[PDB]
Amino acid sequence: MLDINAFLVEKGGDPEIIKASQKKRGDSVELVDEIIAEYKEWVKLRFDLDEHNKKLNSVQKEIGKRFDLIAEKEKLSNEKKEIIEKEAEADKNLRSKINQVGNIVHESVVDSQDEENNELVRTWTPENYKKPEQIAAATGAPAKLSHHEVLLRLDGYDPERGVRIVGHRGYFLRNYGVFLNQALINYGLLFLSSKGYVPLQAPVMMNKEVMAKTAQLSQFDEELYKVIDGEDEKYLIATSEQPISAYHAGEWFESPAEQLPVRYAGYSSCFRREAGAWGIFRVHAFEKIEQFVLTEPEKSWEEFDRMIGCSEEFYQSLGLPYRVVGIVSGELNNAAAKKYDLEAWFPFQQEYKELVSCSNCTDYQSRNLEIRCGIEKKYVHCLNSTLSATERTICCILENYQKEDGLVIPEVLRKYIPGEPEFIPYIKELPKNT
Amino acid sequence: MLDINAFLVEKGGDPEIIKASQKKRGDSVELVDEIIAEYKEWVKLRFDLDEHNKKLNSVQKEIGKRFDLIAEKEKLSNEKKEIIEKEAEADKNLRSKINQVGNIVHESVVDSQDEENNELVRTWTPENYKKPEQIAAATGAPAKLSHHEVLLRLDGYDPERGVRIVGHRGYFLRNYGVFLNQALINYGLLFLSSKGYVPLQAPVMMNKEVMAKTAQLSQFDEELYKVIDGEDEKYLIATSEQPISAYHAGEWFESPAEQLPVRYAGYSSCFRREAGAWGIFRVHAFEKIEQFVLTEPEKSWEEFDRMIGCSEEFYQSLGLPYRVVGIVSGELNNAAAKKYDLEAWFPFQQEYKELVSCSNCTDYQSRNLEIRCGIEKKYVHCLNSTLSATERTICCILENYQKEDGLVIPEVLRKYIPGEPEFIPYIKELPKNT
């Protein structure tokens, strides 16, 4: 969340800047004024408390000199009890309100509630692909089949037995489906580590209290599965960004010039209660390689560019056309000050679909997790960016690498697959011949 | 579970054989007699029902001829209602009792409640390792460090941040920890597929009703995490054997000579509520490559040998000494008719520790899942055997590949690791120097 002092002009803050940000987000502006007011009640309480302490010590010294005053003592004391309780209430209410206020929207971000206004940052195409159309980019073939249809014809997954065993959108991966998923995971880890990222495989369960410090309210009552562990409860993570963001909680980069940046290639499975048609594009459980980076506050915008640059390079290496768009303010989650999505071309769908989101969260989370930077307190900046949601990335590959008789295996992935096939044939026909 | 007719001498069964098996298991013998008795009540009810139907049709024809009897009609009808209800009760009670009876213990199995009597099936050592002692098998070095200590010194995992984020035995894998885990997964999938297994990555959530058909009672109120999904509940799997066993539920191998055997190289993460000291040897979440095989009933014992033979070859290829032991009857779970464990030598621990269990479950599960075989009904046999519990397998590797300054990377794993290192140095010292 934001620093309390950010709301307070007497402590160098600028609440107008917060109101402007709130408005760009399409969130509550009045929340700022409530916060300022609640803070004043807390301050009033603290003074009354401060005054009671001084009065109590003073009156006890008078009682001492007597070797009626005592009646006043019990009175100040009973009032102090109330004040202490009220102060705690005010502090609690203040913090819960502050918790509702989103990170300051960066000035570069487009101010709008309508994604039609997303900024078009850049467009990339493989050199033999003239422009985005209904043509598989890597093969030049008609993009005849959707990703789920290519995957069905390859016998690369099982949604039907999947649905029977775990319900809606459940799936097994089969054969080359398995090999392609692993290929992306391992190619992804190799790609980031060669760029100095530290591979980090995160646990997929998290204690409630840690999760609450890194993920926003909406995330719980909607996105996360709860786990019952006898009498205890944990959450399944939606992304390794959650546990990895907390990896350095309560730590201090006291020599940041030398110690930062820290870059993690996070890997884990991911679980989302909200998913949605057919296929492995939007499902409840999937794997992801995630970039998570801590930097000095002064260096995060530059890092942001480097990180989206890593993802771009990655997709280029897979030969997948894409565009990068700057998400409008009304669509940023609370922590993000700025967000770029890389959206790759799906030639059957004939549309760009999101494969990567990259966000600079400045010190919004690090403030909560108490991750300090250097010598009020100064915190690191935290950034996160998808490298690959692997099943979804497989979907993009399926559409762009299809041809009449099967699937060309992206060259960079071949070494990761037994036999290093350059091509794998369709095994099955669809109930819809043409 | 066993066929009902197995309990019934009039239907060719042999309840004495079931009692003998129960006794070997150290489970209830009287359960058999209860089952036989409950079955007789069900039969008595069915006859009374059968008799009422015939009486009802007969008496209605007399009522028809009248163009008092009607009073008798309403009476037979009210009795029929009761009988129908009782029959259903008897059937329910019968089935729940049958469900408690374990699979028939195979004659080769040692009859004992004490694992000291496990059969010693075979022993294998790498050719330059004379005998099991406190020496790292692959390097000949003193087995100075336990697996967790080697992993700490390599900076290959993080139990401390792990514990903070997800609690007891929580861990991140780091760097080479990640690469070693993936190496085993991919080496494992390649190893089984080259032997004709089909790679199958299973979902890690299962609907309650399917899980109950494949896993025994004890497994729920003890082993499995429950997942809350709004108003619904699912389980996290303890092993891909669970969902994969149900993969062919309700299917029929009508031409088994040609269609069987079916062999799956299952891959998934695994979750167990019961785990336990320090390290990644016994933890709540880990990955496993599992063999799961369906065969004709006549071929399963031969398959059992082939499957343990696959695991043996696998460990040999990793250069890890081991023994194979035949688990005593009192230690078999309900489904297993026979079980072999491969237990690998841990030179620091100076003991053999279980890495693989391989079981022939004959048709105990397939009967429940209705997986028929060929032209009462005949079902396939189901067998399951660990190939590698990967984190635990890493532990064995750590102890056997350690030397004074770091870890030798098992040759077969090298190609799966960036840089294909032959050796990786210790990065960290332990708080206990010597």
PDB file of C-alpha atoms in Angstrom, chain B residues 144-380:
ATOM      1  CA  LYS B 144      30.503 -36.612   5.032  1.00  0.00           C
ATOM      2  CA  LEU B 145      27.260 -34.689   4.551  1.00  0.00           C
ATOM      3  CA  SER B 146      23.598 -35.660   4.742  1.00  0.00           C
ATOM      4  CA  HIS B 147      21.435 -34.867   1.696  1.00  0.00           C
ATOM      5  CA  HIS B 148      20.007 -31.715   3.237  1.00  0.00           C
ATOM      6  CA  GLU B 149      23.561 -30.559   4.124  1.00  0.00           C
ATOM      7  CA  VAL B 150      24.848 -31.141   0.580  1.00  0.00           C
ATOM      8  CA  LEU B 151      21.785 -29.246  -0.760  1.00  0.00           C
ATOM      9  CA  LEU B 152      22.349 -26.378   1.665  1.00  0.00           C
ATOM     10  CA  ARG B 153      26.009 -26.112   0.675  1.00  0.00           C
ATOM     11  CA  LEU B 154      25.052 -26.042  -3.017  1.00  0.00           C
ATOM     12  CA  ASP B 155      22.543 -23.310  -2.312  1.00  0.00           C
ATOM     13  CA  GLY B 156      20.053 -25.585  -4.050  1.00  0.00           C
ATOM     14  CA  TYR B 157      17.000 -25.002  -1.866  1.00  0.00           C
ATOM     15  CA  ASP B 158      15.501 -22.682   0.742  1.00  0.00           C
ATOM     16  CA  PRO B 159      13.786 -24.318   3.718  1.00  0.00           C
ATOM     17  CA  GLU B 160      13.920 -21.218   5.894  1.00  0.00           C
ATOM     18  CA  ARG B 161      11.990 -18.860   3.555  1.00  0.00           C
ATOM     19  CA  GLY B 162       9.971 -21.928   2.608  1.00  0.00           C
ATOM     20  CA  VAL B 163       8.853 -22.468   6.179  1.00  0.00           C
ATOM     21  CA  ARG B 164       7.944 -18.782   6.556  1.00  0.00           C
ATOM     22  CA  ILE B 165       5.756 -18.760   3.454  1.00  0.00           C
ATOM     23  CA  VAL B 166       3.930 -22.122   3.640  1.00  0.00           C
ATOM     24  CA  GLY B 167       4.874 -23.526   7.049  1.00  0.00           C
ATOM     25  CA  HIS B 168       6.161 -26.958   8.115  1.00  0.00           C
ATOM     26  CA  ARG B 169       8.631 -28.501   5.628  1.00  0.00           C
ATOM     27  CA  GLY B 170       7.812 -25.847   3.006  1.00  0.00           C
ATOM     28  CA  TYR B 171      10.665 -25.184   0.586  1.00  0.00           C
ATOM     29  CA  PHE B 172      11.784 -23.397  -2.521  1.00  0.00           C
ATOM     30  CA  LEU B 173      14.190 -25.071  -4.907  1.00  0.00           C
ATOM     31  CA  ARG B 174      16.979 -22.791  -6.109  1.00  0.00           C
ATOM     32  CA  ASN B 175      19.255 -22.849  -9.050  1.00  0.00           C
ATOM     33  CA  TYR B 176      20.698 -26.327  -9.522  1.00  0.00           C
ATOM     34  CA  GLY B 177      17.991 -27.658  -7.250  1.00  0.00           C
ATOM     35  CA  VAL B 178      15.561 -26.581  -9.930  1.00  0.00           C
ATOM     36  CA  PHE B 179      17.687 -27.880 -12.766  1.00  0.00           C
ATOM     37  CA  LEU B 180      18.231 -31.258 -11.031  1.00  0.00           C
ATOM     38  CA  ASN B 181      14.508 -31.689 -10.342  1.00  0.00           C
ATOM     39  CA  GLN B 182      13.603 -30.904 -13.990  1.00  0.00           C
ATOM     40  CA  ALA B 183      16.413 -33.132 -15.200  1.00  0.00           C
ATOM     41  CA  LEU B 184      14.901 -36.098 -13.360  1.00  0.00           C
ATOM     42  CA  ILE B 185      11.433 -35.331 -14.657  1.00  0.00           C
ATOM     43  CA  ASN B 186      12.590 -35.104 -18.233  1.00  0.00           C
ATOM     44  CA  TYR B 187      15.101 -37.944 -18.020  1.00  0.00           C
ATOM     45  CA  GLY B 188      12.336 -40.005 -16.425  1.00  0.00           C
ATOM     46  CA  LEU B 189       9.783 -39.252 -19.165  1.00  0.00           C
ATOM     47  CA  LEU B 190      12.370 -39.983 -21.868  1.00  0.00           C
ATOM     48  CA  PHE B 191      13.387 -43.244 -20.148  1.00  0.00           C
ATOM     49  CA  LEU B 192       9.820 -44.597 -19.911  1.00  0.00           C
ATOM     50  CA  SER B 193       8.678 -43.409 -23.337  1.00  0.00           C
ATOM     51  CA  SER B 194      11.651 -45.185 -24.937  1.00  0.00           C
ATOM     52  CA  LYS B 195      10.197 -48.298 -23.256  1.00  0.00           C
ATOM     53  CA  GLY B 196       6.817 -47.694 -24.859  1.00  0.00           C
ATOM     54  CA  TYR B 197       5.147 -45.803 -22.038  1.00  0.00           C
ATOM     55  CA  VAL B 198       2.818 -42.940 -23.022  1.00  0.00           C
ATOM     56  CA  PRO B 199       3.681 -39.677 -21.276  1.00  0.00           C
ATOM     57  CA  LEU B 200       0.656 -38.466 -19.357  1.00  0.00           C
ATOM     58  CA  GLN B 201       0.588 -35.373 -17.205  1.00  0.00           C
ATOM     59  CA  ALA B 202      -2.287 -35.621 -14.786  1.00  0.00           C
ATOM     60  CA  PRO B 203      -4.370 -32.859 -13.199  1.00  0.00           C
ATOM     61  CA  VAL B 204      -3.602 -32.509  -9.494  1.00  0.00           C
ATOM     62  CA  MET B 205      -7.216 -31.958  -8.430  1.00  0.00           C
ATOM     63  CA  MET B 206      -9.831 -34.664  -8.408  1.00  0.00           C
ATOM     64  CA  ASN B 207     -13.565 -34.728  -7.853  1.00  0.00           C
ATOM     65  CA  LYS B 208     -14.463 -36.438  -4.575  1.00  0.00           C
ATOM     66  CA  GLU B 209     -16.534 -39.213  -6.144  1.00  0.00           C
ATOM     67  CA  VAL B 210     -13.869 -40.395  -8.561  1.00  0.00           C
ATOM     68  CA  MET B 211     -11.164 -40.268  -5.919  1.00  0.00           C
ATOM     69  CA  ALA B 212     -13.281 -42.447  -3.603  1.00  0.00           C
ATOM     70  CA  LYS B 213     -13.415 -45.198  -6.228  1.00  0.00           C
ATOM     71  CA  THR B 214      -9.655 -45.427  -6.500  1.00  0.00           C
ATOM     72  CA  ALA B 215      -8.336 -44.615  -3.029  1.00  0.00           C
ATOM     73  CA  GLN B 216      -9.013 -46.387   0.292  1.00  0.00           C
ATOM     74  CA  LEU B 217     -10.810 -44.859   3.303  1.00  0.00           C
ATOM     75  CA  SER B 218      -7.638 -44.213   5.315  1.00  0.00           C
ATOM     76  CA  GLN B 219      -6.306 -42.133   2.439  1.00  0.00           C
ATOM     77  CA  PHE B 220      -8.931 -39.375   2.903  1.00  0.00           C
ATOM     78  CA  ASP B 221      -9.096 -38.672   6.628  1.00  0.00           C
ATOM     79  CA  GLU B 222      -5.342 -38.394   6.813  1.00  0.00           C
ATOM     80  CA  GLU B 223      -3.471 -38.152   3.548  1.00  0.00           C
ATOM     81  CA  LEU B 224      -5.301 -35.817   1.173  1.00  0.00           C
ATOM     82  CA  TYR B 225      -5.703 -32.051   1.204  1.00  0.00           C
ATOM     83  CA  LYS B 226      -9.226 -30.865   0.543  1.00  0.00           C
ATOM     84  CA  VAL B 227      -9.741 -27.969  -1.894  1.00  0.00           C
ATOM     85  CA  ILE B 228     -12.539 -25.406  -1.481  1.00  0.00           C
ATOM     86  CA  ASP B 229     -13.857 -24.174  -4.780  1.00  0.00           C
ATOM     87  CA  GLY B 230     -16.708 -21.821  -3.868  1.00  0.00           C
ATOM     88  CA  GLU B 231     -19.465 -24.245  -2.848  1.00  0.00           C
ATOM     89  CA  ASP B 232     -17.738 -27.324  -4.262  1.00  0.00           C
ATOM     90  CA  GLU B 233     -14.864 -29.404  -2.931  1.00  0.00           C
ATOM     91  CA  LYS B 234     -12.157 -31.421  -4.626  1.00  0.00           C
ATOM     92  CA  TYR B 235      -9.053 -33.234  -3.392  1.00  0.00           C
ATOM     93  CA  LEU B 236      -5.432 -32.662  -4.260  1.00  0.00           C
ATOM     94  CA  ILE B 237      -3.918 -35.943  -5.453  1.00  0.00           C
ATOM     95  CA  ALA B 238      -1.221 -37.828  -3.462  1.00  0.00           C
ATOM     96  CA  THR B 239       0.057 -39.367  -6.710  1.00  0.00           C
ATOM     97  CA  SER B 240      -0.735 -39.346 -10.421  1.00  0.00           C
ATOM     98  CA  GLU B 241      -1.672 -43.016  -9.917  1.00  0.00           C
ATOM     99  CA  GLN B 242      -4.973 -41.741  -8.570  1.00  0.00           C
ATOM    100  CA  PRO B 243      -6.258 -39.805 -11.599  1.00  0.00           C
ATOM    101  CA  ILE B 244      -4.493 -42.070 -14.086  1.00  0.00           C
ATOM    102  CA  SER B 245      -6.095 -45.202 -12.582  1.00  0.00           C
ATOM    103  CA  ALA B 246      -9.440 -43.597 -13.376  1.00  0.00           C
ATOM    104  CA  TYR B 247      -8.384 -42.506 -16.853  1.00  0.00           C
ATOM    105  CA  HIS B 248     -10.071 -45.552 -18.463  1.00  0.00           C
ATOM    106  CA  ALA B 249     -12.924 -45.844 -15.947  1.00  0.00           C
ATOM    107  CA  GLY B 250     -16.069 -47.234 -17.616  1.00  0.00           C
ATOM    108  CA  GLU B 251     -14.186 -48.334 -20.715  1.00  0.00           C
ATOM    109  CA  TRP B 252     -13.823 -51.781 -22.227  1.00  0.00           C
ATOM    110  CA  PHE B 253     -10.773 -53.388 -23.762  1.00  0.00           C
ATOM    111  CA  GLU B 254     -12.844 -55.748 -25.885  1.00  0.00           C
ATOM    112  CA  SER B 255      -9.827 -56.877 -27.938  1.00  0.00           C
ATOM    113  CA  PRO B 256      -7.210 -57.144 -25.215  1.00  0.00           C
ATOM    114  CA  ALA B 257      -4.651 -59.194 -27.196  1.00  0.00           C
ATOM    115  CA  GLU B 258      -4.250 -56.243 -29.484  1.00  0.00           C
ATOM    116  CA  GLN B 259      -5.206 -53.348 -27.176  1.00  0.00           C
ATOM    117  CA  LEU B 260      -3.288 -54.327 -24.045  1.00  0.00           C
ATOM    118  CA  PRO B 261      -1.025 -53.736 -22.329  1.00  0.00           C
ATOM    119  CA  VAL B 262      -1.422 -49.998 -21.961  1.00  0.00           C
ATOM    120  CA  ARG B 263       1.509 -48.269 -20.270  1.00  0.00           C
ATOM    121  CA  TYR B 264       1.566 -44.718 -18.931  1.00  0.00           C
ATOM    122  CA  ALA B 265       4.434 -42.593 -17.822  1.00  0.00           C
ATOM    123  CA  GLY B 266       2.478 -40.466 -15.377  1.00  0.00           C
ATOM    124  CA  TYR B 267       3.819 -37.099 -14.285  1.00  0.00           C
ATOM    125  CA  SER B 268       2.418 -34.702 -11.737  1.00  0.00           C
ATOM    126  CA  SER B 269       3.099 -32.923  -8.522  1.00  0.00           C
ATOM    127  CA  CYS B 270       1.890 -34.811  -5.404  1.00  0.00           C
ATOM    128  CA  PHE B 271       0.488 -33.570  -2.113  1.00  0.00           C
ATOM    129  CA  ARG B 272       0.475 -35.392   1.199  1.00  0.00           C
ATOM    130  CA  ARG B 273      -0.828 -34.047   4.518  1.00  0.00           C
ATOM    131  CA  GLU B 274       1.392 -36.520   6.391  1.00  0.00           C
ATOM    132  CA  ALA B 275       5.108 -35.822   6.169  1.00  0.00           C
ATOM    133  CA  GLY B 276       7.246 -36.894   9.136  1.00  0.00           C
ATOM    134  CA  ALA B 277      13.696 -34.420   9.469  1.00  0.00           C
ATOM    135  CA  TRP B 278      15.255 -31.479   7.605  1.00  0.00           C
ATOM    136  CA  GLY B 279      15.551 -31.649   3.805  1.00  0.00           C
ATOM    137  CA  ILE B 280      13.419 -32.526   0.762  1.00  0.00           C
ATOM    138  CA  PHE B 281      13.229 -36.248   1.491  1.00  0.00           C
ATOM    139  CA  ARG B 282       9.802 -36.315   3.121  1.00  0.00           C
ATOM    140  CA  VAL B 283       7.775 -33.206   2.293  1.00  0.00           C
ATOM    141  CA  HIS B 284       4.154 -32.221   1.640  1.00  0.00           C
ATOM    142  CA  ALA B 285       4.544 -31.398  -2.045  1.00  0.00           C
ATOM    143  CA  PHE B 286       6.883 -32.992  -4.567  1.00  0.00           C
ATOM    144  CA  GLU B 287       6.973 -34.310  -8.100  1.00  0.00           C
ATOM    145  CA  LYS B 288       6.780 -37.905  -9.212  1.00  0.00           C
ATOM    146  CA  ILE B 289       7.108 -39.898 -12.382  1.00  0.00           C
ATOM    147  CA  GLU B 290       4.821 -42.886 -11.986  1.00  0.00           C
ATOM    148  CA  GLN B 291       4.382 -46.067 -14.023  1.00  0.00           C
ATOM    149  CA  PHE B 292       0.767 -47.077 -14.430  1.00  0.00           C
ATOM    150  CA  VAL B 293      -0.073 -50.140 -16.499  1.00  0.00           C
ATOM    151  CA  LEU B 294      -3.221 -51.968 -17.529  1.00  0.00           C
ATOM    152  CA  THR B 295      -2.866 -55.576 -18.642  1.00  0.00           C
ATOM    153  CA  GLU B 296      -4.831 -58.737 -19.311  1.00  0.00           C
ATOM    154  CA  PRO B 297      -5.402 -60.644 -16.064  1.00  0.00           C
ATOM    155  CA  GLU B 298      -3.234 -63.477 -17.404  1.00  0.00           C
ATOM    156  CA  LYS B 299      -0.266 -61.144 -17.981  1.00  0.00           C
ATOM    157  CA  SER B 300       0.023 -58.976 -14.918  1.00  0.00           C
ATOM    158  CA  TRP B 301       2.616 -60.991 -12.889  1.00  0.00           C
ATOM    159  CA  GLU B 302       4.976 -60.949 -15.829  1.00  0.00           C
ATOM    160  CA  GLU B 303       4.264 -57.203 -16.139  1.00  0.00           C
ATOM    161  CA  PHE B 304       4.999 -56.739 -12.479  1.00  0.00           C
ATOM    162  CA  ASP B 305       8.498 -58.113 -13.098  1.00  0.00           C
ATOM    163  CA  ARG B 306       8.981 -55.899 -16.139  1.00  0.00           C
ATOM    164  CA  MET B 307       7.961 -52.808 -14.185  1.00  0.00           C
ATOM    165  CA  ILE B 308      10.220 -53.321 -11.198  1.00  0.00           C
ATOM    166  CA  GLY B 309      12.826 -54.151 -13.848  1.00  0.00           C
ATOM    167  CA  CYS B 310      12.290 -50.711 -15.411  1.00  0.00           C
ATOM    168  CA  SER B 311      12.819 -48.936 -12.099  1.00  0.00           C
ATOM    169  CA  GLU B 312      15.950 -51.014 -11.357  1.00  0.00           C
ATOM    170  CA  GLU B 313      17.417 -50.073 -14.724  1.00  0.00           C
ATOM    171  CA  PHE B 314      16.615 -46.472 -14.018  1.00  0.00           C
ATOM    172  CA  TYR B 315      18.515 -46.421 -10.702  1.00  0.00           C
ATOM    173  CA  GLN B 316      21.366 -48.341 -12.273  1.00  0.00           C
ATOM    174  CA  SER B 317      21.591 -45.688 -14.941  1.00  0.00           C
ATOM    175  CA  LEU B 318      21.955 -43.152 -12.112  1.00  0.00           C
ATOM    176  CA  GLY B 319      24.647 -45.286 -10.413  1.00  0.00           C
ATOM    177  CA  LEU B 320      22.775 -45.563  -7.111  1.00  0.00           C
ATOM    178  CA  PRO B 321      23.183 -48.802  -5.075  1.00  0.00           C
ATOM    179  CA  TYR B 322      19.909 -50.334  -3.964  1.00  0.00           C
ATOM    180  CA  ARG B 323      18.086 -53.410  -2.794  1.00  0.00           C
ATOM    181  CA  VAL B 324      14.632 -54.689  -3.750  1.00  0.00           C
ATOM    182  CA  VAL B 325      12.490 -56.070  -0.926  1.00  0.00           C
ATOM    183  CA  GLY B 326       9.148 -57.918  -0.919  1.00  0.00           C
ATOM    184  CA  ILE B 327       6.893 -56.190   1.590  1.00  0.00           C
ATOM    185  CA  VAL B 328       5.331 -58.434   4.228  1.00  0.00           C
ATOM    186  CA  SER B 329       1.580 -59.066   4.070  1.00  0.00           C
ATOM    187  CA  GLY B 330       0.762 -56.999   7.179  1.00  0.00           C
ATOM    188  CA  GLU B 331       2.130 -53.894   5.417  1.00  0.00           C
ATOM    189  CA  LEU B 332       0.225 -54.157   2.108  1.00  0.00           C
ATOM    190  CA  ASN B 333      -2.464 -51.587   1.468  1.00  0.00           C
ATOM    191  CA  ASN B 334      -5.908 -52.913   0.459  1.00  0.00           C
ATOM    192  CA  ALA B 335      -5.449 -52.890  -3.317  1.00  0.00           C
ATOM    193  CA  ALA B 336      -2.030 -54.522  -3.510  1.00  0.00           C
ATOM    194  CA  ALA B 337      -1.830 -58.286  -3.957  1.00  0.00           C
ATOM    195  CA  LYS B 338       1.953 -58.009  -3.995  1.00  0.00           C
ATOM    196  CA  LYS B 339       4.426 -55.158  -3.488  1.00  0.00           C
ATOM    197  CA  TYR B 340       8.154 -54.702  -4.075  1.00  0.00           C
ATOM    198  CA  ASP B 341      10.015 -51.675  -2.777  1.00  0.00           C
ATOM    199  CA  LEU B 342      13.285 -50.552  -4.284  1.00  0.00           C
ATOM    200  CA  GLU B 343      15.270 -49.007  -1.442  1.00  0.00           C
ATOM    201  CA  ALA B 344      18.388 -47.079  -2.365  1.00  0.00           C
ATOM    202  CA  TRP B 345      21.520 -46.767  -0.258  1.00  0.00           C
ATOM    203  CA  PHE B 346      22.005 -43.477   1.541  1.00  0.00           C
ATOM    204  CA  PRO B 347      25.688 -43.518   2.592  1.00  0.00           C
ATOM    205  CA  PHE B 348      25.522 -40.700   5.141  1.00  0.00           C
ATOM    206  CA  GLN B 349      22.466 -42.215   6.774  1.00  0.00           C
ATOM    207  CA  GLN B 350      24.130 -45.589   6.296  1.00  0.00           C
ATOM    208  CA  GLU B 351      20.755 -47.201   5.528  1.00  0.00           C
ATOM    209  CA  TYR B 352      18.570 -48.224   2.661  1.00  0.00           C
ATOM    210  CA  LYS B 353      15.635 -45.909   2.093  1.00  0.00           C
ATOM    211  CA  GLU B 354      12.556 -46.454   0.007  1.00  0.00           C
ATOM    212  CA  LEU B 355      12.522 -44.674  -3.369  1.00  0.00           C
ATOM    213  CA  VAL B 356      10.131 -46.946  -5.285  1.00  0.00           C
ATOM    214  CA  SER B 357       7.053 -49.056  -4.459  1.00  0.00           C
ATOM    215  CA  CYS B 358       5.722 -51.335  -7.192  1.00  0.00           C
ATOM    216  CA  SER B 359       2.395 -53.110  -6.735  1.00  0.00           C
ATOM    217  CA  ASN B 360       0.159 -55.489  -8.639  1.00  0.00           C
ATOM    218  CA  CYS B 361      -3.385 -54.572  -7.697  1.00  0.00           C
ATOM    219  CA  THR B 362      -4.927 -57.169 -10.004  1.00  0.00           C
ATOM    220  CA  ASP B 363      -8.553 -56.164 -10.625  1.00  0.00           C
ATOM    221  CA  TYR B 364      -9.326 -54.683  -7.239  1.00  0.00           C
ATOM    222  CA  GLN B 365      -9.561 -51.114  -8.537  1.00  0.00           C
ATOM    223  CA  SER B 366     -10.563 -51.912 -12.089  1.00  0.00           C
ATOM    224  CA  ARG B 367     -13.629 -53.700 -10.686  1.00  0.00           C
ATOM    225  CA  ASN B 368     -14.623 -50.459  -8.931  1.00  0.00           C
ATOM    226  CA  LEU B 369     -13.827 -48.266 -11.972  1.00  0.00           C
ATOM    227  CA  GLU B 370     -15.580 -50.729 -14.343  1.00  0.00           C
ATOM    228  CA  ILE B 371     -12.608 -51.216 -16.684  1.00  0.00           C
ATOM    229  CA  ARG B 372     -13.495 -54.414 -18.531  1.00  0.00           C
ATOM    230  CA  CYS B 373     -11.216 -56.771 -20.351  1.00  0.00           C
ATOM    231  CA  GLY B 374     -12.264 -59.112 -23.159  1.00  0.00           C
ATOM    232  CA  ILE B 375     -15.561 -60.992 -23.565  1.00  0.00           C
ATOM    233  CA  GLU B 376     -19.439 -62.693 -14.351  1.00  0.00           C
ATOM    234  CA  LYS B 377     -17.506 -59.699 -15.786  1.00  0.00           C
ATOM    235  CA  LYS B 378     -13.752 -59.882 -16.400  1.00  0.00           C
ATOM    236  CA  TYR B 379     -11.678 -56.746 -15.673  1.00  0.00           C
ATOM    237  CA  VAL B 380      -8.161 -55.632 -16.606  1.00  0.00           C
TER     238      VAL B 380
END
